[PDB]
Ligand SMILES: Nc1ncnc2c1ncn2[C@@H]1O[C@H](COP(=O)(O)OP(=O)(O)OP(O)(O)=S)[C@@H](O)[C@H]1O
């Protein structure tokens with residue numbers, strides 16, 4: 206549904 | 214008849230101590246909420262305005278305590294939600310609409326009784342933007358939550374699954390008259406106000422260098438707060454505009470902690486007294502020990518909730534051995550016991 | 563209906579743990595008092611009875627995780643061991659705080675009234691302690707955010723859990739009465755405490771300098787911990803206020819290591835004794851070998867967990883050719899065997 210993709 | 218600010222405040226004083234300005238704001242709001250709904254569709258001054266509340270104070274000041282104690286005396290429905298679990302634009306977490314759904318559980322799906330309810334939110338600081346400028350990338354637990362609440366606070370239609378559903382039956386519930394009580398201990402706000410208020414920011418002769426440890430008192434600093442200060446914190450002006458009222462609390466005074474353990478009914482001293490009452494053992498707490506505990510608690514800078522560490526650390530040995538002991542009818546804890554240089558006196562039958 | 567006492571439960575944990583008299587007292591008082599708050603059914607004058615969580619702190623391999631494991635055996639009420647390394651701020655892909663609750667219900671057979679009185683344990687809590695300045699630049703999904711989410715879980719709330727994972731319905735379970743025992747070896751906590759206790763750099767003429775004569779001992783130093791010290795480490799004051807009690811554990815000692823191999827039933831010495839019992843061979847361990855093993859383990863700076871490397875590295879050659887050998891009924895390990903100068907003597911039946 207919702208993708209929480211984050212990279213430091 | 215209806216209650217009054219003096220009567221509702223007298224009730225909260227039994228459960229809360231040392232918060233004068235905070236009790237006044239909630240009393241006027243609750244006292245005014247009955248007036249707005251009662252005058253709805255019967256007063257010529259139609260489209261009555263609304264005024265939400267935004268509580269602010271240090272940790273352990275009594276924010277979450279006021280919401281619980283208020284439900285005891287409040288007649289209309291009340292709920293206790295949290296900002297941290299909300300998610301904007303229908304993501305993995307719960308949606309804004311879930312807040313209204315929890316209200317119907319306590320209201321028994323009474324829409325006419327749900328619109329006149331009150332709502333409370335805790336830990337509002339968790340959704341604040343980390344930086345002053347808007348985040349370049351999308352945020353799931355920040356600014357977006359504020360955006361979805363704008364139309365909610367002002368007033369908007371909502372979708373609520375009546376029974377056995379998450380996402381073909383929707384009940385409409387307006388929100389222009391629903392009250393919202395947001396609260397949260399904003400961390401780091403003292404640094405922002407100092408730059409704005411002190412304005413020194415210098416090293417030379419003409420620039421002033423405030424003497425170490427005699428400045429920016431949290432109690433006196435929050436009083437000078439303004440909406441512009443929260444913008445640098447991360448909140449959006451559109452969100453703060455929905456909450457005109459602001460309440461500035463104070464840090465727990467040394468004298469206040471002594472009263473919190475004696476005057477309230479749910480004090481820790483009364484709690485432990487009941488813990489040993491079933492054990493056939495009494496308890497005592499002399500004034501010489503209370504005043505000494507106040508200096509230890511304030512050093513922790515944690516609030517009223519950091520008091521159990523001082524008490525349980527002292528009564529650890531005593532509680533560990535009291536059940537094994539027999540013919541024990543009363544326990545006395547003098548001031549020395551708190552410092553750790555002595556052992557609590559025991560009285561046998 | 564006679565409940566156990568601290569002296570009785572301490573005898574059980576003493577069989578599995580050694581040299582943790584300070585930590586065992588805390589778990590005994592909490593478990594003891596937990597049944598008292600549970601026993602009450604709102605039939606006492608005291609209301610809103612207090613809660614007291616526990617925060618275990620100790621070196622690596624000192625036995626923190628072992629205390630929670632053995633505790634669940636003798637414990638009647640449910641118990642869990644939820645890893646906190648994988649926890650993520652609610653609203654993100656990785657994980658939610660709710661997952662912890664779901665585990666508790668599997669142990670209690672989905673008994674809400676029986677799960678509310680359960681116990682919860684968390685490991686590796688230092689993994690979420692963010693070490694940084696105020697994070698204006700970025701938002702942490704596993705650091706500061708996770709700790710804030712936990713605050714709502716504690717002190718009282720209502721959450722949502724699927725019925726065994728799944729209807730589109732959830733069950734509400736209060737958590738005001740649920741106890742939490744968070745514990746994780748905080749690495750680097752000694753350096754921050756030293757600044758508070760040493761009080762000086764000592765590059766000047768007047769300032770005193772004791773670089774190694776008065777150097778702080780790690781064991782003693784943790785005893786002097788306080789909540790303000792943890793704020794520098796990364797913890798939030800709001801998080802520490804929920805955990806007033808603190809338990810500091812001492813490092814292993816040469817004398818303590820010898821008792822770990824003999825008194826506990828789950829000792830490594832007894833493990834290898836049973837490993838060869840099925841093979842029809844006896845095992846022995848003389849005291850001269852234990853004293854040498856203790857010195858080698860302390861140098862590794864790993865604790866009790868760094869003991870198998872000393873044993874298995876020595877008995878590698880012996881175990882490799884033990885099955886092929888015949889008529890061997892007993893084995894003796896001398897001090898020289900640990901040093902590697904000689905080989906372990908073998909006996910023939
Ligand atoms: N004014 C007060 N009078 C008496 N006890 C208080 C008061 N304020 C706090 N306490 C004590 O502190 C406990 C916790 O109070 P809270 O309302 O949770 O403080 P808090 O500021 O809301 O914490 P937050 O918002 O999660 S940072 C209460 O259960 C009381 O025991």
Ligand SMILES: Nc1ncnc2c1ncn2[C@@H]1O[C@H](COP(=O)(O)OP(=O)(O)OP(O)(O)=S)[C@@H](O)[C@H]1O
Nearest residue numbers: 578579580622623624625626627628747822866867
């Ligand atoms: N007091 C003790 N007596 C006997 N064995 C112990 C003791 N403490 C630790 N051990 C051994 O160490 C193993 C692991 O102990 P742990 O509880 O994991 O230590 P720890 O402090 O939890 O390390 P962390 O926190 O997981 S890094 C146990 O399975 C035992 O074999």
